[PDB]
Amino acid sequence: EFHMLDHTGFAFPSEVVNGRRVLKTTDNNSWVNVTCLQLQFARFRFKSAGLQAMWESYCTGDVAMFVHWLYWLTGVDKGQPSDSENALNMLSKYIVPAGSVTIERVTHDGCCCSKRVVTAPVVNASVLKLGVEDGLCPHGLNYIDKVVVVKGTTIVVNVGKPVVAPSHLFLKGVSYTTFLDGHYTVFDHDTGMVHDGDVFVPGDLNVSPVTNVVVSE
Amino acid sequence: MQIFVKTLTGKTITLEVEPSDTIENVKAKIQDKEGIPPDQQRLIFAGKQLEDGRTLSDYNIQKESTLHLVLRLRGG
Ligand SMILES: [Zn+2]
16 A cells, blocks of 8 residues: 555655756666656646645655655566656556547558547657558558647657657657667757756757657647 | 457567457467567557556457557666
């Protein structure tokens, strides 16, 4: 039972960098840092008042309880590296929906075609404007799945490996989680600068392998 | 029934499953064919990550459905 547990071990030294709460790189916690960064970039709130208080505490620099809860929800032990895209997917059902994404599933010639609106805070789709190939149609051609409409704020999580691509080919977003191999960072679109633990270093999206993006209409 | 899984190398495999098969059971089947340990598998269907303890029926996964396999990242 989470409330019974010692959180003191998860009190990672934190800072404010470009107005964002960030954790010092220690104990393989980069996954925690970029998960929490994208929650701030997306401006997400939790359905539970108890979780939302833990989140507000994290942002004001009382990080231990919300960080522990992340480890606890995801089944990760202190000092173990993990997966931000997994953590974000597991966080999704706890977050108040604040937007939607329309996914077009089509063939180049239009043999078969559809659109579906997804209204979860975290949606798994291509982070590229051109989309990804995804399964064969009854007529016998491979489907392309791409994001074609953005309402409010969603976090799009790539269906695949981290993606290296000329920056213009990515879905338009405010922030891009990048993975190098591993170690997680966040490309800030506004500044063109990179959140790497508790420092702000220059970076290039064209060579950043992107795993997820905060999209906002 | 038959469903399809898009593997890490972009090729498509076939699984023999029932609607009442758990996501753990589907992951065990991908492990048999792909060698990817269940705890390292993330399965995507209709933009959703599938949860352990739930079944294919809970997500309305019908025959000739294509799941997407994504390998777990270790970021420190
Ligand atoms: Zn077709």
